[PDB]
Each structure stands twice: as C-alpha cells, then as structure tokens.
Design a protein around this ligand. Structure first.
Ligand SMILES: *[C@@H]1O[C@H](CO)[C@@H](O)[C@H](O)[C@H]1NC(C)=O
Ligand SMILES: COc1ccc(-c2cc[nH]n2)c(O)c1
Length: 341
C-alpha cells in the first residue's frame, strides 16, 4: 500500500483550496523512482467546474481522500504483476486541479477555484528530494489519459527543476499512456474547450512548443504529435489505435461511412507515431493501460508492454530480440488477438 502525504507547502492546492498531496511507498534498495499522474477529464468555466464539484469532488479536493491506496499495474511491487519495475519507489499523485496538469493560478478574490497542476508536480518533486529522491538514478514521470498529456506538458520542466537545484545525475524520462490525441474532423458535428480552459487556468506549456506556435495558439501544445518533437527528455508513448476517449469526442458510438472513418483514424494515428522510436500502439478499442492489473496481457508483434519498457531501459544505457517501437499495422479494432475483452 502507498501512504498519503499532504503537501507541506499548503499554498499549493487542489481546486477548492485544500492541500494537494501524493501517495508514497519507498523501496530503500532501489534508485528508481516512478511518479504517476492520475487522469480524469477537466473543467473549463465556472458553471462546468461547479457541476464537477457536485459529483466528482475527489478530483477537486483532498478533504475526502483515504489514508492509503493499493499500487496496481506498473505501481505494483509484486514481480508477477509488474515484471518491469516491481522494486522501484512508487508515487501516485492524485489529479485535483482539473487543468490537464497545466495550471499555475491560485484562488483569490477574482478566482473561485485554483488551477495549480504544473505547480503541484514541481512541489511533489521538491518534497520527495528529502525522502530519498536525492539519491535516484532515474525519475520516470508516467501518467494515463489527462495524466498522459500531463507527462508531455511537464517532463522537461521537471528535468530543468532538478538541474537548477543541483542534481544533474538524475535522469528524467516520461511515459505517456492514452494521452496522444488527434485534432481531427468529427464523425458527426471541440478545440475551443481547450482554448477556453488555458485562459481560465493560466495554463502553461513547454517553452520550445510555445515559441513555435506563439501567443494565442498554445492549445496546439496539448496535442501529442505537435508537442512531442519539441521535447528533450526521452518519452515512451503508449496509445491504443482506436482510443475510446478519442472516439467519444469524435461522436462515434457498421455502414461504409463509419467503416472508412474508423479505418482512417487508425491510419492517421499510426502515421503520427512513425517517427516516435519508443512507442506501443495496439489495434484495439480501449482506454488507459499502465495501472491496470492485467496490463501484462496485451502484445504487439509478440512483445508485451512490460517487455518493451525493459527494452527501452536497455536502449538508454537496435537490440536483437528486444524491440522498443511496436505499432500494429492491421486496420480494425481487435485485429490483434491479444486486445482486452
Ligand atoms: C509555496 O508554493 C508557492 C507557490 O508555488 C510559492 O510561491 C512559495 O514560495 C512556496 N513556499 C515555500 C516556503 O517554498
Ligand atoms: C479525447 O481527447 C480529445 C480528442 C479529440 C479532440 C478533438 C479536437 C478536435 N477534434 N477532435 C480533442 O480536443 C480532445
């Protein structure tokens, strides 16, 4: 079990002003640290944040969080469940900022809510340095869904933070699960919600990407295929080719028109990953994977996700029999027999 710690700097807060925090299980025989960002959509104005506060309050407040959480999947300490990193130090960072981990705005007399996701990540890193992170060899910042997009937005800022604090030996890397979306045409009739959100949150994006797209166009940096080329830290991308959240936003719930739409979506996703050397993209209809208990089951070309991540670790010291770029070529959901049922 991972144990809750509320942030000692109580000015770094969830949406409603309660302290943010993290859940931790230390492994004193290991110099590997895994910091996982939870997902859970977002809110973008007063009225829809108020609705979220009524029925999704754990995503906006720490007042009701439990003392412990069970580590599952990549956060599990059991070798049978986690062949990749079972002996690592484990951290689960709850998502209570509703801002895709991008915000840097405090509650005030003009702001009903605080959007502090980017600051929460940096404060967790700071407080962990006193609990053993100072001795780390590798810090892997991982996340699923909104947390996966959060990895892409924040991994280089964590690398910069540690360099500036005097820890240039810690190797910072990212693992983005189910956060790689396409700003495509919908099947039936979007990006305007992200544009409004960024202004509402005082959202921040990585430097190089912001310099490319410039003022007013920072929403572009929330799309993996546009922000990834600007990143300096190594990032492994996990994305189902027919992601359920992508299809929901596309208004897809089979005749020729829909068949061609679905096949084109898989082809476009595969194209965006052609030049991503560390990636895992199966031809399945699903959403999220890395903290699911059965994340060991899926395979692409005969290689499981835990194996591909281990091969990635070796590459950061092509490898015979140990691949790191694994993207399905078959064009319909569940043409891969190992897809989740
Ligand atoms: C607490 O966090 C806020 C926001 O990041 C920062 O302005 C302040 O300096 C921090 N306090 C300390 C003691 O580091
Ligand atoms: C699931 O996340 C998504 C998926 C798709 C879009 C999008 C934007 C324009 N077209 N489609 C998005 O903004 C978020």
């Amino acid at each position: 079990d991972l144990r809750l710690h509320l942030l000692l700097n109580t000015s770094v807060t969830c949406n409603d002003g309660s302290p943010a925090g993290y859940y931790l299980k230390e492994s004193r025989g290991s110099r590997r640290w895994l910091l996982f960002l939870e997902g859970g959509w977002y809110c973008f104005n007063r009225e829809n944040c108020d609705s979220r506060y009524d029925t999704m309050r754990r995503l906006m407040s720490s007042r009701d969080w439990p003392r412990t959480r069970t580590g599952t999947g990549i956060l599990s300490s059991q070798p049978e469940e986690n062949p990749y990193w079972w002996n690592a130090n484990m951290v689960f960072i709850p998502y209570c900022s509703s801002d895709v981990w991008s915000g840097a705005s405090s509650k005030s007399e003009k702001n009903e809510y605080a959007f502090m996701g980017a600051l929460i990540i940096q404060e967790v890193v700071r407080e962990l340095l006193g609990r053993g992170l100072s001795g780390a060899k590798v810090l892997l910042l991982a996340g699923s869904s909104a947390g996966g997009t959060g990895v892409l937005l924040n991994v280089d800022r964590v690398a910069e933070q540690l360099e500036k604090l005097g820890y240039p030996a810690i190797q910072v890397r990212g693992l983005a699960d189910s956060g790689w979306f396409l700003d495509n045409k919908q099947y039936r009739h979007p990006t305007e919600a992200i544009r409004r959100g960024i202004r509402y949150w005082n959202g921040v994006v990585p430097e190089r990407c912001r310099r490319q797209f410039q003022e007013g166009e920072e929403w572009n940096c929330f799309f993996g295929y546009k922000v990834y080329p600007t990143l300096r830290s190594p990032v492994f991308v996990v994305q189902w080719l027919f992601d359920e959240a992508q299809l929901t936003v596309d208004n897809v719930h089979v005749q020729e028109g829909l068949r061609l739409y679905i096949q084109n979506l898989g082809r476009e996703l595969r194209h965006t990953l052609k030049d991503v050397p560390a990636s895992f993209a199966p031809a399945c209809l699903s959403h999220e994977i890395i903290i699911r208990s059965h994340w060991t089951d899926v395979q692409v070309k005969g290689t499981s996700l835990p194996r591909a991540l281990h091969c990635w670790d070796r590459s950061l010291h092509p490898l015979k029999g140990c691949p790191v770029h694994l993207v399905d070529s078959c064009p319909w959901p569940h043409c891969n027999p190992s897809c989740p049922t």
